[PDB]
Amino acid sequence: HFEPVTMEEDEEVLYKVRAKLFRFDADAKEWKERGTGDCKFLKNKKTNKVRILMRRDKTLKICANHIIAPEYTLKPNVGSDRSWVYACTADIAEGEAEAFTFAIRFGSKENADKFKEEFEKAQEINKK
Amino acid sequence: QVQFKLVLVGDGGTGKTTFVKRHLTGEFEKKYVATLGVEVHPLVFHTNRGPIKFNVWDTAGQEKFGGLRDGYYIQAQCAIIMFDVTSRVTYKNVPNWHRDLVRVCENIPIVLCGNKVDIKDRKVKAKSIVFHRKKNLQYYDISAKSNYNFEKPFLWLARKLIGDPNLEFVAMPALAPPEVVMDPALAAQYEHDLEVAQTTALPDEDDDL
Amino acid sequence: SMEGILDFSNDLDIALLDQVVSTFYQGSGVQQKQAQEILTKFQDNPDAWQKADQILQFSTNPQSKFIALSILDKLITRKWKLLPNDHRIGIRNFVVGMIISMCQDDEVFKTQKNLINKSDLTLVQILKQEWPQNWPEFIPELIGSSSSSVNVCENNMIVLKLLSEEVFDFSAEQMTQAKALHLKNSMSKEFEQIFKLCFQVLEQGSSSSLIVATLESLLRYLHWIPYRYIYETNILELLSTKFMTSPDTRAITLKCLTEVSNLKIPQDNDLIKRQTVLFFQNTLQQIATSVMPVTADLKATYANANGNDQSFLQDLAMFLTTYLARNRALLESDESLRELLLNAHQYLIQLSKIEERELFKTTLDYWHNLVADLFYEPLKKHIYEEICSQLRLVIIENMVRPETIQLYKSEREVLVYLTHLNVIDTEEIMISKLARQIDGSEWSWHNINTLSWAIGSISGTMSEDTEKRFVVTVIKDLLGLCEQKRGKDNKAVVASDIMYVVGQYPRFLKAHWNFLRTVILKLFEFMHETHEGVQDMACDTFIKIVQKCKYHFVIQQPRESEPFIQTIIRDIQKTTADLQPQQVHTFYKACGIIISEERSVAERNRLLSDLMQLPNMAWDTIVEQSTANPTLLLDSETVKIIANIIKTNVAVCTSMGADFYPQLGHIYYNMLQLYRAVSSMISAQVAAEGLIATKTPKVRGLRTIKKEILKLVETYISKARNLDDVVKVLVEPLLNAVLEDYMNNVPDARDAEVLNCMTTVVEKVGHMIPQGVILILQSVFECTLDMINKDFTEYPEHRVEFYKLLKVINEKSFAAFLELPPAAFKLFVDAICWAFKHNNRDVEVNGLQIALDLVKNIERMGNVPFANEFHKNYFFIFVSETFFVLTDSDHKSGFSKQALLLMKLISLVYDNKISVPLYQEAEVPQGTSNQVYLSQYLANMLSNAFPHLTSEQIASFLSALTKQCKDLVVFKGTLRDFLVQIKEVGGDPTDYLFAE
Amino acid sequence: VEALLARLRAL
Ligand SMILES: Nc1nc2c(ncn2[C@@H]2O[C@H](COP(=O)(O)OP(=O)(O)NP(=O)(O)O)[C@@H](O)[C@H]2O)c(=O)[nH]1
Ligand SMILES: [Mg+2]
């Protein structure tokens, strides 16, 4: 005989798409990029609740972390056929839960519409 | 804590403040608002060796706004020298920034960054960029606009400051977000803000994303 | 609060300053920010320097003293000569005394290096002002003081280092030519005494901090001192032995020896050649015995990044490459020097394996220098056979993606040379590498890609016969590699590399038609593959092969019934049915490349007609429906279809150029009608929805139609050979369709692409349409100028295209500006000067060129009323505006063209090319020459803009400038001297005699 | 040369 020498594990990925996330700066009446990367819908195996979790490329820092609440409504932005705007009441990407008006843009209108499909599925999951 | 003073220097307009802002908030500031003297921002990265905090001293590149100038460099532990690959003069001035920096900071790791490589008509050609060689500076082409190599300067500095060449950025822990409880008292308020946001066009709609 | 230190009516509270300083450097957040603004205001107080003596004496905060010296630095640099002579002496005295006392306290000397270094630099600023003319004893007394104290001696090495830097390394842009020469000659005159001290310190040890500082100063000296100080003393032996053994001195010593390798040296002196060999021999011996042997794994050492290993390996690469590029011939004939030569190159081989992009580029530059010499120089290549064999493997294994682009081209260049030097060894290495992909020992996606790029990079080097067997072998091995893999992820990677290699060997394809045909058909199959990236690869490879082998698609090959281009066109719908629009356009562009090689015009137009059958049929239907129901354009799908049809025409026009005219004629009239219909819809939408409409997908889609139409016309006209048809068929409908629409849209709906299209029209046929050019100006000049003349940022594309258009109009149809009403010609001049003030290079350069071309246009008219009025109205405007951007420190990028413009303006008066008085006759005696008046005007202008200059400075500057207005290089030197003097008080007026 | 063609088509 010779002797020899994130907190995402509890979750299931329902949907994943590349996206660019914006937040509306009301004071400046300006949209401001918050991050670009993979947006994931994560389903908790113990609570069955689905959240959005999005991290920036390379640095991997969180730019979105909130429940896909059934109260939310995806609306179109005047300048895009591949984006959705919605109000978020509690996102903890940068610390304490805070309300944001988000906009999320995708590589194509097809991806945007699929996102909306999955988004509304996740809302019903969270309703039960 | 594990905290390192970083000074960022270079000609006015080269993108120093836009680069830092990209790292602080993820935004790309299109306007040029000149820095007055210095602006100090904490910046944290999560690594396989724990968090590393850079105290970024973003200095003014315009002479009329130079402030304390090399007085900002005192006790810097690392630095970024910035130039603009679309402006030859900004590279011509790299030796001047480096001179003033290393006279105060005699042995610190320094990254030299050629910014704005997203622009088609590049003026400072890759093969003209050789100043870093004899000065032992790390060099990267970068673009705060496209994010090309935007993480490399801090990754390299982190490895040098911690003394671990295998240091890597890692994914910050992601806690469970809280459940929503809509406040009826703010329904009309959030509907006002949403309408404005819907009717303000997203920028850069021709970008791939 | 902290703001008390800004009250100079009270004594300075040093304790409060130290609190402000501490709050800034050690504090955080809002407090730190407030302190910063207070400190900046304190430092900028023009009387703050008076309180520097107090701070340096009574402060206990070293940062406070640093700021005190910065305050003095600004005073010494800019206002020294304005001081009473008593303050000059006083400041000198307490800077010297402060340095002496800091050096005499070992604890202060140990712990306040930052403050001592700052004080030393401040001393050097005084020396630049006072020495040697008012400080002749400085160097003799410095040498004397060095002997009484190791601390003072070490600090004196720092002072001398900074002095050398300020005089020889950083003087060009910071002092006048005369003052720089004065300080350089002063240092050269006394360097014999400086070197003696330096050499004594180095020879006699023994404090390493003293030795290091001395070697740091020597590094600076090596930039300028004569070689005799290095070759007629024993210093090379010390550098290359003694100081290489100790790591403390090793880093700086290696940098010194790198600069020694760059000294100006007589190259017909045998003793000096032996000394140059000897110090290299010594250095390499010290490395192998004290640092690492030749066999060491420098890749691993560099990656571990212990201590200063990375900087040392970088510096060793710089030393070896520098020395060998200059001196390796010294080592190549003497048999006793062969081991040294090859050991040095073996270290370079090991350094070239390091994973570090910028270091690899440094070593690759050297390798290029070497192999180019072996390629041309008789009897050299056999020396380096084993080095080159290892280098082949290094470069193959580190090949980067061709399309990083620059690095690939540099690697390809070296590998091509290495292939000529030994084709057999190159082939064997590549085949062997391929064998290790097949056997899995080195299989990976990255590894097979890297090898395929290397194989592709040497095409055109081997003989056609060897190449053929080589290509066959590679493809055979690659096909087998793909067959044995599974999953289609792996098969996709290898199939792409197969197509990449064949695309790199057009010579093989042109000789084997059946092979070339099979490749293309297989590319067409891959155009149906959905796997991510396969379709882009197939389209990219297709046009790449076409560009190189086009002739073989346009002739009828043996055994074939028709040229293959016919066969491609017959099936184009099927081939491209699964492609994205962008990929379809590439496919059509490739077909146009082939068609343009058909010399028979009737056959070429027939092929063009057949190629464009699908877009033309979609076009005809849409035109028929859009005309019947203008509402159909509201359909986003129709707008997208229309844009892609036009883009297909652009793509084919891009490759066919002049030969595209028949297809353009098929669509031209209906296309411009569509431009108008789309224009009406855009305007109607903006009217009904507001400016925000321009952001909407619908309007952006409509404007894409307009932009692609403009691009198509611009593309054809830029390449047309029949310019009569351009003028008589294309131009008038074009201008009628685009100009009024541009003029009468609100600014946010105007397409900058209109300006770009008009620039090409003027460039190509401007000389033939004088009235058309006038119409272009009338429609775009004033309304575009009003968009861009309120700031420097709004409408960035219109701004750039605007000055491109004025530039070409001024070049090709200057008469159009002669027709302008006087008020509009004034706006033209205003617009040019406006361009001067841009920091935007894309505008400033055209503005300076327009001004210069305009002056020449006026000069060509001779002595006529328009030219006489131009000079009376605008000569001094251009002189003063050029002077403003030259001297305001915010337009340094334009210096060379500003200088050219000013010299042209001055030489007009100096050459008496302005036939009318530039003054109003009531202003100076009648008969006064324009030369005299120009001198007076400029003297008065500069006196008011730079009131701190003496009248003598201004007069001497202008005297030099005006007699140098035929010699641009000297003219520019005088301007640079002026830019130095305006930054300080008391500049010497005789500096402007430097040229004389 | 021709033995490659068949292999080429089966990719
Ligand atoms: N196209 C492009 N623009 C950039 C990039 N980075 C910064 N910019 C732009 O360059 C301009 C100047 O940016 P800024 O960050 O203020 O430069 P700075 O070095 O901080 N200037 P100062 O030293 O005077 O404070 C801004 O308009 C910014 O949007 C880039 O990577 N690409
Ligand atoms: Mg800034």
Numbering used by the authors:
A (entry chain B): 64 to 68, 78 to 200
B (entry chain A): 8 to 216
C (entry chain C): 0 to 376, 414 to 439, 461 to 1053
D (entry chain D): 1183 to 1193
The paper states:
The chromosome region maintenance 1 protein (CRM1) or Exportin-1 (XPO1) binds 8–15 residues-long nuclear export signals (NESs) in hundreds of different protein cargoes. NES sequences are very diverse but each usually has 4–5 hydrophobic residues (often Leu/Val/Ile/Phe/Met; labeled Ф0–5) that bind hydrophobic pockets (labeled P0–P4) in a hydrophobic groove formed by HEAT repeats 11 and 12 of CRM1 (9–16). All NESs also participate in hydrogen bonding with Lys568 of HsCRM1, and mutagenic/structural analysis identifies Lys568 as a selectivity filter that blocks binding of non-NES peptides.
We study three NESs that uniquely match the all-helical class 3 pattern (Ф1XXФ2XXXФ3XXФ4). Class 3 NESs from mouse diaphanous homolog 3 (mDia2NES: 1179SVPEVEALLARLRAL1193) and the cell division cycle 7-related protein kinase (CDC7NES: 456QDLRKLCERLRGMDSSTP473) are indeed all-helix peptides, both forming 3-turn α-helices that occupy only the wide part of the CRM1 groove. The last residue of the mDia2 protein (Leu1193) binds the CRM1 P3 pocket leaving the P4 pocket empty. The mDia2NES and CDC7NESsequence patterns should thus be Φ0XXΦ1XXXΦ2XXΦ3. The Φ4 anchor position is clearly not used in mDia2NES and CDC7NES even though Φ4 is key for activities of several other NESs. The number of Φ anchor residues necessary for CRM1 binding can vary between 3–5. (C) The overall structure of the engineered ScCRM1 (grey)-Ran•GTP (orange)-RanBP1 (purple)-mDia2NES (pale green) complex. All eight NESs bind HsCRM1 in the presence of RanGTP with dissociation constants (KDs) of 670 nM-20 μM, and were crystallized bound to the previously described engineered ScCRM1-RanGppNHp-Yrb1p complex.
